[PDB]
Amino acid sequence: QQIDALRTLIRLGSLHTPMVVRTAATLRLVDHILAGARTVKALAARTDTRPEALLRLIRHLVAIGLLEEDAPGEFVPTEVGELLADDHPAAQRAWHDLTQAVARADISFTRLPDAIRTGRPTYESIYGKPFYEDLAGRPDLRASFDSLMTTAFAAPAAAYDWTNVRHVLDVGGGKGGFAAAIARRAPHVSATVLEMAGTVDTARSYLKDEGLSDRVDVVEGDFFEPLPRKADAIILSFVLLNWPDHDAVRILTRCAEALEPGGRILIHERADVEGDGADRFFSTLLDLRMLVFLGGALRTREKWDGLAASAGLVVEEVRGPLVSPNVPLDSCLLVLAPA
Amino acid sequence: TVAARPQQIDALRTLIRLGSLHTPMVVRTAATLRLVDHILAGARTVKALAARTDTRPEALLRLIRHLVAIGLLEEDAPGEFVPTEVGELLADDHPAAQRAWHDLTQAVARADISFTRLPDAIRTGRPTYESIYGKPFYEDLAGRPDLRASFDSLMTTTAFAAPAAAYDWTNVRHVLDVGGGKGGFAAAIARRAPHVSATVLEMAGTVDTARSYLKDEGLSDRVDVVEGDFFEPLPRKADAIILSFVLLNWPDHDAVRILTRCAEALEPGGRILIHERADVDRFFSTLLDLRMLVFLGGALRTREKWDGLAASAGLVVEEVRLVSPNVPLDSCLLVLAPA
Numbered sequence: 001q002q003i004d005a006l007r008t009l010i011r012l013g014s015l016h017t018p019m020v021v022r023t024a025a026t027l028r029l030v031d032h033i034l035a036g037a038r039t040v041k042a043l044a045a046r047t048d049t050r051p052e053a054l055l056r057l058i059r060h061l062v063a064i065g066l067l068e069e070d071a072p073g074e075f076v077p078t079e080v081g082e083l084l085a086d087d088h089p090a091a092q093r094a095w096h097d098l099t100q101a102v103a104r105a106d107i108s109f110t111r112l113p114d115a116i117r118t119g120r121p122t123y124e125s126i127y128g129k130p131f132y133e134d135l136a137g138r139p140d141l142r143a144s145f146d147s148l149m150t151t152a153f154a155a156p157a158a159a160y161d162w163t164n165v166r167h168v169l170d171v172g173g174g175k176g177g178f179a180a181a182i183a184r185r186a187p188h189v190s191a192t193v194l195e196m197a198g199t200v201d202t203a204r205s206y207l208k209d210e211g212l213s214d215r216v217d218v219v220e221g222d223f224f225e226p227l228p229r230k231a232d233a234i235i236l237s238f239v240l241l242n243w244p245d246h247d248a249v250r251i252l253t254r255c256a257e258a259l260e261p262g263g264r265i266l267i268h269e270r271a272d273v274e275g276d277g278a279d280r281f282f283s284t285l286l287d288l289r290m291l292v293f294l295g296g297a298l299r300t301r302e303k304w305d306g307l308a309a310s311a312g313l314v315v316e317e318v319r320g321p322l323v324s325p326n327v328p329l330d331s332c333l334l335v336l337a338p339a
Numbered sequence: 340t341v342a343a344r345p346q347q348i349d350a351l352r353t354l355i356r357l358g359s360l361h362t363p364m365v366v367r368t369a370a371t372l373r374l375v376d377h378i379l380a381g382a383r384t385v386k387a388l389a390a391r392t393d394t395r396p397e398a399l400l401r402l403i404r405h406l407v408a409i410g411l412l413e414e415d416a417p418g419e420f421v422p423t424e425v426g427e428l429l430a431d432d433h434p435a436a437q438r439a440w441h442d443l444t445q446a447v448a449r450a451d452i453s454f455t456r457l458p459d460a461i462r463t464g465r466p467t468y469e470s471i472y473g474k475p476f477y478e479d480l481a482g483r484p485d486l487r488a489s490f491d492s493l494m495t496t497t498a499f500a501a502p503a504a505a506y507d508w509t510n511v512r513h514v515l516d517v518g519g520g521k522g523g524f525a526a527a528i529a530r531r532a533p534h535v536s537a538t539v540l541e542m543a544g545t546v547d548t549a550r551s552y553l554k555d556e557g558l559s560d561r562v563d564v565v566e567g568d569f570f571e572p573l574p575r576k577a578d579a580i581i582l583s584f585v586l587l588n589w590p591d592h593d594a595v596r597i598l599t600r601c602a603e604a605l606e607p608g609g610r611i612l613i614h615e616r617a618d619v620d621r622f623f624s625t626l627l628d629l630r631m632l633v634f635l636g637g638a639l640r641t642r643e644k645w646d647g648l649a650a651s652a653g654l655v656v657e658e659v660r661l662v663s664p665n666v667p668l669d670s671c672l673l674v675l676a677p678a
């Protein structure tokens with residue numbers, strides 16, 4: 001009765017289990033196993049690890065249900081464990097790779113009390129630069145982050161009607177997947193992706209390869225500055241949660257000043273609601289991630305109305321639960337009009 | 340179109356739970372802020388909680404949301420949070436001391452940061468603690484008396500009566516508890532066999548806490564305490580020399596160094612008693628074993644590994660007695676004799 005509470009709490013507060021997974025991801029272990037390395041001796045060679053040490057790590061991967069000893073000395077991935085394959089469409093190996101952007105950013109959680117004391121992010125205290133200024137100097141991290149955010153925008157593009165939309169402006173649109181999804185849904189629409197340096201190059205590649213350059217262009221810029229052009233739909237897809245309140249209102253005010261008459265601003269975000277249930281585990285992961293990464297947050301409908309009002313907008317409507325293929329969390333789309 | 344397959348989303352939701360860094364650090368933050376003690380002391384609103392914890396209220400409520408989601412807190416009344424049964428273990432007076440084991444300002448939860456560089460320990464085989472805090476574990480503690488004290492308190496959580504009944508002290512006159520901590524093992528023995536005297540061999544600072552604890556137990560007359568280094572010649576000889584949760588702190592060559600010192604300190608017909616978990620719930624065995632890796636380059640050891648280590652120091656494993664208290668992990672007692 002009390003040992004179960006004791007076993008639960010130790011298990012909840014255990015730091016070695018998440019880091020065992022992340023180490024297994026960074027080492028590309030499941031890939032090497034599926035590539036024919038069953039033993040510790042071969043796996044340790046492929047992963048350039050000490051065999052004694054690798055086995056102790058494997059012992060825990062077996063214990064938490066990711067690896068299984070099928071035949072003596074041979075380890076294979078379980079059903080959950082196969083999701084650590086590098087070509088799995090959930091991209092969970094890349095999400096737990098300590099060399100890529102997100103899992104490297106998750107070290108900010110080691111200083112959570114600081115962020116709770118101040119409400120301000122800890123990523124800078126660990127890595128010396130705020131997140132996006134750090135990506136701007138680390139082309140490997142900029143590259144790996146941009147590919148993670150693309151893990152296809154089909155549901156959010158169907159939740160809007162484009163018939164009288166002429167141009168679309170995807171502010172912070174990453175690689176262009178949302179803009180490309182729109183262009184595939186409405187052949188008359190042209191779009192522009194306003195993105196950061198480095199990201200603009202891979203946004204132009206993806207749109208070229210989609211065959212859509214003749215319709216979706218890319219502008220490198222800053223969305224706290226005057227936006228490059230006016231549009232009938234200004235898209236904010238997973239941007240505003242990166243930002244404290246005054247910075248989100250800044251972005252919105254810039255998006256409002258670029259709205260054509262009858263235009264709209266589209267916030268495509270997870271907005272936490274009170275009665276999620278078992279869905280709160282992943283809402284709180286994102287929200288806390290936004291705190292320690294950047295000082296941003298997930299917002300409720302009440303908060304958006306205040307943000308929109310501060311930016312001279314108003315929340316017309318929210319389109320219901322939007323389901324994406326390989327996420328644990330549905331998102332939604334808020335339609336904003338001039339106040 | 341988008342296709343949401345539950346069995347995939349369940350395994351995906353499972354893996355994210357396993358690799359998530361925020362759940363353990365949320366717990367660790369709750370323990371360091373002493374959140375459960377404050378709620379018990381009459382702070383129920385997040386306002387009073389933030390005032391007692393000196394945190395930003397909006398940031399504290401976002402931490403509580405995950406605490407509620409992982410089942411350590413529940414919302415009795417709106418804005419009113421209380422510790423669940425599992426969460427009650429975070430109370431500082433609880434006998435499992437779980438809040439202190441998760442206190443980021445105390446020794447163990449602080450040392451757990453070594454896990455953030457686990458791939459380094461798996462690639463190279465020895466600890467990462469020094470690369471984070473500037474010194475190997477016990478040298479760090481010698482310069483931080485708060486951590487020295489904090490660690491010593493933690494290790495005291497029976498009071499060693501369980502493995503004390505496992506040895507027959509009839510023909511033991513004096514006992515040397517090498518690295519004996521506060522003296523609980525010495526005291527547990529002394530309280531069980533009134534003829535045996537004892538000498539505890541410990542480090543600076545720990546000698547004071549051991550000395551004072553052995554006086555408040557009515558035992559200064561019987562158990563002596565000597566400050567020393569067990570890599571050096573032991574201060575005197577004994578009929579039983581205890582190594583209780585010492586050798587797992589050390590790689591193979593340092594362990595045979597300690598064992599040699601004990602064999603050289605043996606009275607004729609004397610024995611060396613190793614008190615540890617002999618590697619064979621695997622979840623909690625792996626925590627200690629991997630902790631000993633990233634903390635100190637140590638490890639749990641199977642019996643066959645003990646035979647080699649014993650031989651290298653001129654010892655032989657005489658018998659292995661499986662103790663079974665009520666903690667997650669059961670300890671064993673290896674008896675070692677000269678060859």
Ligand SMILES: CC[C@@]1(O)C[C@H](O)c2c(cc3c(c2O)C(=O)c2c(O)cccc2C3=O)[C@H]1C(=O)OC
Binds near residue numbers: 270329
């Ligand atoms: C919340 C669950 C979710 O599935 C929802 C959504 O897919 C999402 C996630 C993660 C992130 C971002 C997302 O939008 C994101 O924008 C972001 C960012 O801008 C800057 C740094 C990290 C992140 C980041 O880690 C997913 C997740 O697995 O963990 C939080």
Ligand SMILES: CC[C@@]1(O)C[C@H](O)c2c(cc3c(c2O)C(=O)c2c(O)cccc2C3=O)[C@H]1C(=O)OC
Binds near residue numbers: 588
């Ligand atoms: C097997 C694990 C166990 O559950 C049971 C066991 O009592 C034990 C634990 C923890 C520690 C030590 C233990 O012996 C221990 O000796 C030690 C040490 O010598 C030096 C530094 C840290 C530690 C340390 O953190 C418990 C635990 O909570 O997980 C490891």
Ligand SMILES: Nc1ncnc2c1ncn2[C@@H]1O[C@H](CSCC[C@H](N)C(=O)O)[C@@H](O)[C@H]1O
Binds near residue numbers: 150172194196
């Ligand atoms: N100051 C700034 N100006 C322009 N873009 C910025 C910016 N600060 C952050 N960003 C961009 O905002 C994006 C947030 S991630 C959003 C990606 C994409 N819109 C999607 O829905 O998947 C990042 O790609 C980052 O490059």
Ligand SMILES: Nc1ncnc2c1ncn2[C@@H]1O[C@H](CSCC[C@H](N)C(=O)O)[C@@H](O)[C@H]1O
Binds near residue numbers: 494584
């Ligand atoms: N070089 C050294 N000489 C003497 N003691 C040492 C030492 N290096 C580490 N130690 C001690 O080894 C102990 C390991 S923790 C074990 C404590 C006690 N035997 C128990 O069972 O609870 C620590 O108290 C630490 O102070």
